[PDB]
Amino acid sequence: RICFNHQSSQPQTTKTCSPGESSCYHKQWSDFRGTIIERGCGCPTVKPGINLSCCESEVCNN
Amino acid sequence: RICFNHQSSQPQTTKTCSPGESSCYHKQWSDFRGTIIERGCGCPTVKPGINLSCCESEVCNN
């Protein structure tokens, strides 16, 4: 599985996930800077209020 | 939980999921006609070749 791992509006970067991993994630919140996005491999648990998205296809998390 | 349940780029419609359901889904594939989007409550099982995205927030599946 290949997942995007770039932050917010940065130039797109990718990461090859560890074997057995079939999910990519998109985590969004806000700070003084504006809209923040964290991307990676997997599907982590987030604190209430944080928007989370998980997908199961190559570079599905833009 | 409230999720979008409209197809492709058709007028937006939502659906009230059953209690306990915290997920919304976004499934995308391409038939002879091209890109097709399907939305709803939960996070269903999908066939290989169809891109599934599940999110956990109100009408998160646009």
Side-chain angles (χ1 to χ4, degrees):
Chain A
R1 168 73 68 243
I2 315 300
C3 294
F4 284 114
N5 78 327
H6 57 114
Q7 276 171 170
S8 310
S9 293
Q10 300 284 321
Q12 304 183 326
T13 57
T14 37
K15 192 193 170 187
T16 295
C17 310
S18 85
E21 185 55 273
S22 77
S23 177
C24 296
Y25 77 88
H26 184 283
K27 201 176 159 182
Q28 200 181 319
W29 73 90
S30 297
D31 74 6
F32 74 98
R33 293 175 297 167
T35 304
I36 318 300
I37 309 157
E38 187 196 89
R39 307 183 179 72
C41 291
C43 189
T45 282
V46 304
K47 304 187 160 206
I50 290 160
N51 292 338
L52 173 80
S53 193
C54 297
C55 56
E56 61 171 351
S57 73
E58 299 295 56
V59 286
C60 59
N61 66 330
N62 184 255
Chain B
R1 172 69 71 252
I2 312 301
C3 296
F4 283 114
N5 71 344
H6 62 105
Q7 201 189 261
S8 315
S9 206
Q10 283 185 341
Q12 285 185 341
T13 55
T14 65
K15 177 199 170 175
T16 312
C17 321
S18 332
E21 181 58 67
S22 65
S23 281
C24 291
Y25 75 85
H26 184 270
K27 85 181 147 205
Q28 191 188 281
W29 78 100
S30 36
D31 85 333
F32 185 85
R33 304 173 301 200
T35 305
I36 311 295
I37 311 287
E38 181 173 309
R39 302 165 178 95
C41 289
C43 189
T45 304
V46 298
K47 195 177 279 288
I50 86 160
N51 311 160
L52 176 67
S53 159
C54 305
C55 56
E56 311 178 336
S57 74
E58 291 298 64
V59 289
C60 62
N61 69 329
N62 41 335

